[PDB]
Amino acid sequence: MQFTLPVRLCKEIELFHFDIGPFENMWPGIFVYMVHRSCGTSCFELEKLCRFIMSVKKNYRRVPYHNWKHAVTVAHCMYAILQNNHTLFTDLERKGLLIACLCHDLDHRGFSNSYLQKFDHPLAALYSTSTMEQHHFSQTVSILQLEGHNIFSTLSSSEYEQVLEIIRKAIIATDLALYFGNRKQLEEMYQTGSLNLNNQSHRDRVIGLMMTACDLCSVTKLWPVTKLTANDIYAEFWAEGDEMKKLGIQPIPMMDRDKKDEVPQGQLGFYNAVAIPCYTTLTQILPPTEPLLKACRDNLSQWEKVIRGEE
Ligand SMILES: Cn1ncc(C(=O)NCc2cocn2)c1C(=O)Nc1ccn2cc(-c3ccccc3)nc2n1
């Protein structure tokens, strides 16, 4: 019992810039298709996988950007990295990473770690750093322990502990505050030539950068997809900005809808300070991911065109 996709999706799903489409009822099948080719038809009991996916879906909320569509989109980018780097990854890693990507923003509310801390949200007392990401990992373990939801139950005890450790580090790594130092370290290790993928602490860092790259992959799509998704991410930013103003705090300009006019220039900074560096170091470490760097640079050039009034 293979999942099969229509011809256009069967071909395009293999490309980094694939968009999973507006038909929500096809996303679970798209995810299972990706597991079956990335991992095998044996990796998970279908009965259990199908029941884990629908529970994960139910625990994503109807926010403009940090939604179920984002979860599946970030898993597809991971699928494309793993398929283009066949022999670099263990079987456990292939299992753990697609599930980590699907779960990485579980129960997100559309608000940053900073807003939780200024609101004095209970989650900010339970987890002093990576507040939302520790919550996402907590929600992932909860769903795994629902009767009939243990997709890993047929792993050995220690293989089980290793896969939950991969998922945990992978989801904490999607805290962008940690990405800056993670990428500097990987930069120095690759340039001085000390990078060693048989060193666990090095693999961990490489997997963390892959998680940042999949997470940000909305900047790697065709320009029409990237530009329409930018509206979703700004609708969350500006809602958070409005909530900052209700706590009596001027938000950062990213979050102030009154400074919308300056979005193009704020996207440039973001591509230059975060996205380009991310995909460059990733392309240095895993050369076949170069199409993500090339699509990101194409989108930087479309924002330069917006600023020159040519759109
Ligand atoms: C975290 N994170 N994750 C994803 C994205 C994102 O912006 N991804 C880009 C994207 C997602 O989907 C389609 N495109 C970001 C991010 O911090 N962006 C940013 C970062 C800095 N800024 C500054 C401004 C801005 C806007 C208006 C006026 C003045 C300044 N604007 C920004 N925006």
Ligand SMILES: [Mg+2]
């Ligand atoms: Mg997140």
Ligand SMILES: [Zn+2]
């Ligand atoms: Zn995310």
